[PDB]
Amino acid sequence: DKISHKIDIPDSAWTIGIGEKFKNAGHPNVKYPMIDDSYVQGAPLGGFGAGTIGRTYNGGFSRWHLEIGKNKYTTVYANQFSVFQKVEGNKDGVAQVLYAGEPENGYLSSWKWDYPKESGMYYALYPNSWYTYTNKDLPVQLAVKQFSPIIPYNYKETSYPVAVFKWTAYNPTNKNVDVSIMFTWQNMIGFFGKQVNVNSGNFNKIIKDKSKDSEIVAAVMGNISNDNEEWNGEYSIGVKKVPGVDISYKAKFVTTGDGSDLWHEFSKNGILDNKDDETPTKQDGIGSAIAVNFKLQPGQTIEVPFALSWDLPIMKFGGGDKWYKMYTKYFGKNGKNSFAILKEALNNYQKWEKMIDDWQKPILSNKSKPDWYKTALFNELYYLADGGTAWENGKVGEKRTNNMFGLLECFDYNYYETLDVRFYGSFPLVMLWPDIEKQVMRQFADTINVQDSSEFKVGSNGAMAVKKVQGMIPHDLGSSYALPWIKINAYDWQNPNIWKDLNSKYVLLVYRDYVLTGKTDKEFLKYTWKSVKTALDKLKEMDKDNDGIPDNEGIPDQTYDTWSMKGTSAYCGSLWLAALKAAQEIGKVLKDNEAYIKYNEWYKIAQQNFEKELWNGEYYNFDTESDHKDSIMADQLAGQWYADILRLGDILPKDHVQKALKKIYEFNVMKFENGKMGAVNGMRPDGIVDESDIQAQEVWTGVTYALASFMKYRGMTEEAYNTAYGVYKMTYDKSGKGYWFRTPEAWTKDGNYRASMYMRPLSIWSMEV
Ligand SMILES: OC[C@H]1O[C@@H](O)[C@H](O)[C@@H](O)[C@@H]1O
Ligand SMILES: [Ca+2]
């Protein structure tokens, strides 16, 4: 490996061998079907609301999130980088697809597949990833840095459906070597969203943009139809000329054929035919190829940028609504703009790299933090782009100031912005894209007094319930299978209108969003104040025994949606205390004296009773009425965790909080698989895991990172990092279960998982407050 020295990969990048097999991988531990796309994954490409494309560590473009809200894992074999090298003095050169695998059928059989093992590495530190190619039959060493411009406090480039591939080539040998790098791409119009004739009308064109000191050559892969539909638009690939390289291209090769129409050209001398051909296809799949060729002398380095864009302007949801994606604000809505996007990237990528470096640098340069923590912190952010992210710039056919936003909880439970989960998972948005965060919270504010009297069947017990109750915060803002933003509470396993955490979490999120953006946004507190008051007032009505605290009803009426709570619970009870304290403070800020006084009164009574009912000398009991009410819950003081973040002070005595956290570390962490797998949710005082429900026996990744953040603010530095390290290890390490770029909600002691690609572990960003 002589190429690593010519590029700059941070030491905290996650690493794996190209073609590496992983032997320890986990699988779903539930009885119903659940997504398991394997451990062959990578950092995604694509902006927020753009649709994303997962290119895996083996080099394939395989995890397709271009249909917004859906996860489709299938390698499109035509989409690759390939290399040709010939040493001056040899009769023949060699050509190789940079893909550690081969197609399942006979398409593209002429291409040279099966990039060999032990011949290169993949590295990731989101939004950047890299591949290095160090192969005994390739005298010139190559590396590529690939990324999309995901930039905090930037709502523009961050939305773009674009990726850059910056190649570096170095000749460590003592002979001249001719090198070519080729990007191939299938015209994927019709890959989704087209019910019949899936390739029909697809055609490819070549754009040559020549102006002083710029030449870009690109393929634009579109369809002859000018219809405005979810399925129509354009893909583009292309390259910018640099001194010392020549560009060649092929406009049309057949992807549903043996590939030799292209490969016979490339494998001969690394130079394509430059054949334009706009003839549309009927049944056959088609693709384009863009290549560069250059000669490297001994000791010479060259850098060359390629790019990929996709202009698919319309997203459609299963309930019928069609919306424009956010990037259309910057490039237009007609779906004929892939070249403009590609050009913007090829002309600005150096600036983008520097903007990404500038935001990562404060963390990366802090030598008090271990590298493993940096690996997790940055790579967990993959989910902001990969989570079915929807960001609208108008409804199609619509005759507004704001752009609605939604991140899925996950793909198996296909719900937008699940509030009980975003309480943990939304930290990166508030910290790094706060205008999006405030938009999402205003969306929730607007739902508070919505009433929907239609009924649904509750999944857990079969009872009928009202869809949406006035004054109750919704569980979610809909499903991609239905009508995001329009039809709320798609979730139906339990009835969220009787949950005891949603209304409190809502309030806490509101105050969080004010505090963590500088305590300056009074307008945001003004917009949300009525809903905050309404939310707390409605929750107060659920106090059945006048102790001043809402009663859990002996069923799962909160985020642990199979784990029953009854009476006053540490979890919902502490959230309530904190939410009352937050509402007092908002009342002070907005000079609503009667609100301040009322919530202060409720707080003092509830606080006194919470401590009496639950403090047992060592920790706070799980609740007051359940069969295992004395279980040690990992999340027992969630309200105090948020109070620390919101700077609301002590809601419970410092000494008692410290004792509780120490007990959780001693038990839920250190007595669960020797503290190497996170914090298990429920443990009995005798040190055996609580078996009352599956959720008690799970580690929740986002709960564990949040608990780590809580320990950290409370000075328990070693315990905080040791607690988080188990989640990092399970996710990323060779000794783990292979969950990189698909961090799940939960695992059990055997390492197997529930709900890969989950929002909650974005809570790791709470460790940076
Ligand atoms: O793992 C528990 C989670 O399951 C999901 O199906 C629900 O939508 C969440 O509200 C819940 O917290
Ligand atoms: Ca009560």
Side-chain angles (χ1 to χ4, degrees), residues 1 3-4 6-90 92-103 105-398 400-769:
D1 180 355
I3 188 75
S4 283
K6 308 303 190 180
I7 58 188
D8 204 14
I9 303 170
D11 291 333
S12 59
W14 179 72
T15 77
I16 193 168
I18 295 174
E20 192 162 328
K21 297 287 186 177
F22 189 72
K23 287 169 186 164
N24 207 7
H27 305 293
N29 61 19
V30 304
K31 283 73 176 74
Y32 51 100
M34 175 159 278
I35 295 160
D36 185 352
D37 294 325
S38 87
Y39 59 78
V40 182
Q41 308 296 335
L45 298 166
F48 296 178
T52 53
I53 307 170
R55 197 189 177 200
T56 77
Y57 71 81
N58 282 340
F61 296 83
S62 306
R63 194 168 74 191
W64 297 91
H65 288 190
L66 294 181
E67 193 183 346
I68 300 302
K70 274 51 160 196
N71 172 77
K72 180 181 177 65
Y73 191 88
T74 186
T75 302
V76 177
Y77 291 105
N79 299 358
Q80 308 288 350
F81 282 96
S82 300
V83 64
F84 169 91
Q85 300 195 8
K86 191 169 78 77
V87 184
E88 224 163 71
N90 297 359
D92 308 314
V94 303
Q96 174 69 60
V97 185
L98 307 177
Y99 178 60
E102 57 180 59
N105 69 27
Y107 297 147
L108 308 180
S109 69
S110 73
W111 295 16
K112 185 66 194 318
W113 294 103
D114 300 306
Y115 185 84
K117 283 175 154 82
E118 288 172 1
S119 304
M121 305 282 293
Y122 176 79
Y123 304 82
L125 194 77
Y126 187 84
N128 290 328
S129 50
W130 301 253
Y131 303 74
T132 56
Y133 301 99
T134 51
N135 183 318
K136 66 190 161 56
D137 294 327
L138 295 175
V140 163
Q141 299 209 335
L142 304 168
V144 68
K145 178 182 177 183
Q146 60 183 33
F147 69 98
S148 293
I150 306 295
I151 298 159
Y153 319 106
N154 177 313
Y155 303 91
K156 181 179 183 180
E157 283 80 6
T158 300
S159 82
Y160 288 3
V162 80
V164 176
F165 307 85
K166 181 187 90 175
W167 286 88
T168 305
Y170 171 65
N171 185 1
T173 79
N174 49 42
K175 282 159 181 204
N176 290 345
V177 180
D178 291 327
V179 182
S180 301
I181 298 160
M182 176 179 65
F183 196 6
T184 46
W185 199 263
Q186 180 165 304
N187 183 332
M188 286 180 67
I189 299 305
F191 177 71
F192 67 101
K194 223 179 170 187
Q195 308 300 291
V196 290
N197 298 312
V198 302
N199 285 311
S200 176
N202 288 355
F203 84 104
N204 301 341
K205 61 188 186 178
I206 296 296
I207 306 300
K208 290 167 190 171
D209 185 325
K210 275 223 196 74
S211 66
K212 294 175 284 285
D213 306 315
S214 182
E215 171 168 10
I216 291 164
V217 176
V220 171
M221 287 157 287
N223 190 277
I224 61 175
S225 177
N226 295 303
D227 292 355
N228 305 109
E229 294 299 342
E230 171 180 54
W231 62 266
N232 200 10
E234 291 175 344
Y235 294 82
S236 184
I237 57 158
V239 70
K240 192 175 172 160
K241 188 172 196 318
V242 300
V245 322
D246 295 315
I247 300 167
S248 70
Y249 63 87
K250 181 162 183 61
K252 188 175 184 192
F253 75 93
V254 173
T255 58
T256 50
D258 80 356
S260 60
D261 50 349
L262 177 73
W263 202 259
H264 89 268
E265 310 184 350
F266 185 69
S267 66
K268 178 74 174 309
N269 56 1
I271 294 163
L272 305 182
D273 60 19
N274 298 337
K275 179 171 177 200
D276 304 66
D277 183 359
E278 299 194 6
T279 307
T281 192
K282 302 227 176 52
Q283 271 184 237
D284 274 318
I286 64 173
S288 297
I290 299 286
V292 294
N293 65 278
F294 52 94
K295 174 193 302 307
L296 278 187
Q297 298 191 70
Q300 183 182 0
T301 295
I302 196 145
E303 170 178 302
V304 64
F306 286 79
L308 162 75
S309 70
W310 50 104
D311 182 11
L312 295 162
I314 294 165
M315 65 186 168
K316 185 196 172 201
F317 297 118
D321 275 3
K322 295 173 201 215
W323 303 88
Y324 293 110
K325 304 170 188 160
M326 186 68 249
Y327 78 88
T328 61
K329 175 159 200 187
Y330 310 109
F331 289 100
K333 293 175 172 186
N334 77 351
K336 305 289 179 178
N337 310 108
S338 65
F339 182 68
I341 299 165
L342 185 102
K343 172 171 175 166
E344 179 68 9
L346 287 168
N347 286 337
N348 293 286
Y349 75 93
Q350 286 166 306
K351 178 163 54 68
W352 298 348
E353 292 180 274
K354 176 62 155 47
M355 291 162 86
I356 290 162
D357 285 347
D358 289 351
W359 78 259
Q360 297 190 326
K361 190 194 177 323
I363 288 165
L364 291 185
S365 69
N366 184 340
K367 305 311 294 185
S368 73
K369 295 176 170 172
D371 278 335
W372 67 262
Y373 165 80
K374 294 168 188 183
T375 306
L377 190 74
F378 287 112
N379 285 308
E380 287 312 308
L381 295 175
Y382 87 91
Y383 192 74
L384 292 179
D386 252 347
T389 309
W391 195 14
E392 61 84 25
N393 186 39
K395 201 160 170 149
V396 174
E398 153 205 280
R400 271 183 304 117
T401 318
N402 287 105
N403 297 112
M404 291 192 300
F405 184 93
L407 185 55
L408 293 173
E409 175 197 321
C410 68
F411 290 88
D412 292 290
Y413 320 137
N414 199 280
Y415 308 126
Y416 280 103
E417 292 297 344
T418 301
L419 188 131
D420 49 290
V421 177
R422 90 184 308 282
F423 177 77
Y424 303 86
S426 64
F427 278 88
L429 290 164
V430 70
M431 294 170 77
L432 303 170
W433 290 277
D435 294 347
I436 288 169
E437 169 63 24
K438 287 171 179 169
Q439 173 59 36
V440 172
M441 290 310 295
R442 286 194 301 270
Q443 292 163 192
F444 278 99
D446 293 352
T447 67
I448 188 105
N449 290 327
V450 173
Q451 176 71 51
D452 182 346
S453 289
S454 57
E455 293 190 350
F456 68 99
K457 178 167 66 59
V458 176
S460 67
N461 63 15
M464 298 308 286
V466 159
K467 169 58 66 154
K468 173 62 171 58
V469 171
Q470 177 274 319
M472 304 307 301
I473 284 288
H475 176 264
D476 63 75
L477 301 180
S479 178
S480 80
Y481 294 113
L483 294 175
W485 304 302
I486 304 307
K487 299 298 168 163
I488 72 192
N489 279 342
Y491 171 88
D492 60 14
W493 175 250
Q494 301 291 3
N495 181 11
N497 298 285
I498 68 173
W499 282 21
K500 309 307 182 308
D501 63 340
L502 292 171
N503 281 20
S504 279
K505 284 178 174 171
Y506 173 71
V507 170
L508 287 166
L509 278 161
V510 165
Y511 191 57
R512 187 198 64 175
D513 290 355
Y514 175 78
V515 172
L516 294 191
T517 63
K519 291 179 149 157
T520 49
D521 197 346
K522 286 195 194 161
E523 190 79 335
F524 173 76
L525 291 184
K526 287 186 171 73
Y527 190 95
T528 58
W529 185 222
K530 291 196 173 158
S531 65
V532 162
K533 291 191 290 192
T534 299
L536 291 175
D537 295 353
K538 293 288 170 171
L539 202 53
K540 189 49 148 58
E541 302 174 352
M542 293 175 183
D543 175 19
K544 293 160 162 188
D545 68 338
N546 201 41
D547 74 342
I549 307 173
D551 289 58
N552 296 96
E553 294 182 58
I555 61 166
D557 55 359
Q558 37 62 48
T559 201
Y560 299 87
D561 72 345
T562 54
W563 201 9
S564 281
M565 292 179 192
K566 199 187 184 169
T568 292
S569 62
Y571 187 66
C572 298
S574 64
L575 294 168
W576 173 242
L577 293 185
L580 293 169
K581 206 155 189 201
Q584 284 172 232
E585 293 304 315
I586 295 163
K588 279 186 58 162
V589 172
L590 303 181
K591 304 190 210 305
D592 184 337
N593 168 259
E594 284 173 337
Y596 168 85
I597 291 176
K598 184 173 80 171
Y599 298 128
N600 186 65
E601 271 171 30
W602 291 3
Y603 175 74
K604 298 318 296 174
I605 298 162
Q607 184 191 39
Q608 179 170 302
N609 288 332
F610 182 95
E611 182 70 17
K612 261 202 195 62
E613 287 164 14
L614 296 179
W615 174 247
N616 69 31
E618 293 179 356
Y619 60 95
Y620 289 88
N621 282 341
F622 173 87
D623 69 16
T624 55
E625 299 178 31
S626 296
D627 298 337
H628 293 166
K629 68 182 67 163
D630 65 349
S631 281
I632 306 153
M633 198 207 186
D635 225 356
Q636 65 187 253
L637 292 188
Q640 182 66 82
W641 167 53
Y642 247 63
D644 288 3
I645 296 167
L646 280 38
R647 308 203 296 270
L648 294 173
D650 297 317
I651 60 157
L652 295 171
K654 279 186 167 83
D655 166 79
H656 294 186
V657 172
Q658 209 76 1
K659 277 172 179 157
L661 284 174
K662 287 184 188 314
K663 189 83 172 177
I664 291 159
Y665 181 73
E666 181 188 10
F667 279 69
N668 303 59
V669 178
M670 290 306 300
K671 295 182 195 293
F672 188 76
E673 303 300 308
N674 199 31
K676 309 297 192 182
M677 294 175 70
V680 75
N681 282 321
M683 196 162 273
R684 306 261 58 213
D686 65 356
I688 289 53
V689 174
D690 190 341
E691 279 162 335
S692 68
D693 185 61
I694 186 56
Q695 289 180 339
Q697 304 171 84
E698 288 180 324
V699 172
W700 283 16
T701 55
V703 173
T704 295
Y705 282 136
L707 172 68
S709 119
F710 189 15
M711 291 173 178
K712 188 186 177 218
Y713 312 142
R714 293 283 167 151
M716 286 166 69
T717 306
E718 174 168 14
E719 296 94 322
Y721 285 86
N722 287 6
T723 293
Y725 177 74
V727 186
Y728 159 83
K729 187 179 174 301
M730 284 290 293
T731 306
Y732 296 101
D733 190 67
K734 71 208 190 189
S735 78
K737 298 301 285 183
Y739 303 141
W740 44 76
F741 304 107
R742 53 172 186 153
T743 317
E745 167 85 292
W747 49 70
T748 43
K749 63 171 174 183
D750 62 356
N752 289 312
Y753 74 85
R754 188 170 57 84
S756 71
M757 302 179 287
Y758 206 77
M759 195 211 296
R760 218 188 298 262
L762 291 168
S763 69
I764 188 173
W765 274 78
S766 72
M767 295 183 73
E768 288 293 307
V769 161

